[PDB]
Write a protein that binds this ligand. Structure first.
Ligand SMILES: NCCCCCCNS(=O)(=O)c1cccc2c(Cl)cccc12
Ligand SMILES: [Ca+2]
Length: 125
C-alpha cells in the first residue's frame, strides 16, 4: 500500500493492531490464502446488510489494493481502516454517486468485531 498507509499500520499499537487484526481474521474466515478476496469481501458485506456483486467486490479490494494484488491481506485490510480514519476526515459532499451505497469503515469494523461479548446495546462500542 502507500508508504503513509504502511506507516500508519506500523504506528498502530498492539491493541490497535489486534483490534484491526480481528476484522482481518473474520474477513478471511475460511480463506485458504488467509487474505480477503471478493468471496470473503462479499461475506463481510452481507453481514453489514450489503450484497455487492463479484465485480464490485473486486473493485472494493482494489481501493485498498494499491499493488493491484486484487485481494486485501493483513496489511491491506489495515490500510482500509487507516484510509477511512485519514486525518480525522469524514466527508459529506460525496453523496450517493457512482455507488449510491456508502459503508462506514467504523460501522463495518463494529459488525465484524461485534461477534463476541456485548453488542446487544453497544454502549461504549
Ligand atoms: N468514511 C469511510 C472511509 C472509506 C473507506 C471504506 C471503504 N468503503 S467500502 O464500501 O468500499 C468497504 C466497506 C467494507 C469493507 C471493505 C473492504 Cl474489506 C474493502 C474495500 C472496501 C470496503
Ligand atoms: Ca494487496
Amino acid at each position: 500500500m502507500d508508504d503513509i498507509y504502511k506507516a500508519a499500520v506500523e504506528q498502530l499499537t498492539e491493541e490497535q493492531k489486534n483490534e484491526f487484526k480481528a476484522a482481518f481474521d473474520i474477513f478471511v474466515l475460511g480463506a485458504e490464502d488467509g487474505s480477503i478476496s471478493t468471496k470473503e469481501l462479499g461475506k463481510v458485506m452481507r453481514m453489514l446488510g450489503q450484497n455487492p456483486t463479484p465485480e464490485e467486490l473486486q473493485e472494493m479490494i482494489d481501493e485498498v489494493d494499491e499493488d493491484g494484488s486484487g485481494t486485501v491481506d493483513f496489511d491491506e485490510f489495515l490500510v482500509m481502516m487507516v484510509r477511512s480514519m485519514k486525518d480525522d476526515s469524514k466527508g459529506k459532499f460525496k453523496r450517493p454517486t457512482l455507488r449510491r451505497v456508502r459503508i462506514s469503515a467504523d460501522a463495518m469494523m463494529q459488525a465484524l468485531l461485534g461477534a463476541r461479548a456485548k453488542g446487544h446495546h453497544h454502549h461504549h462500542h
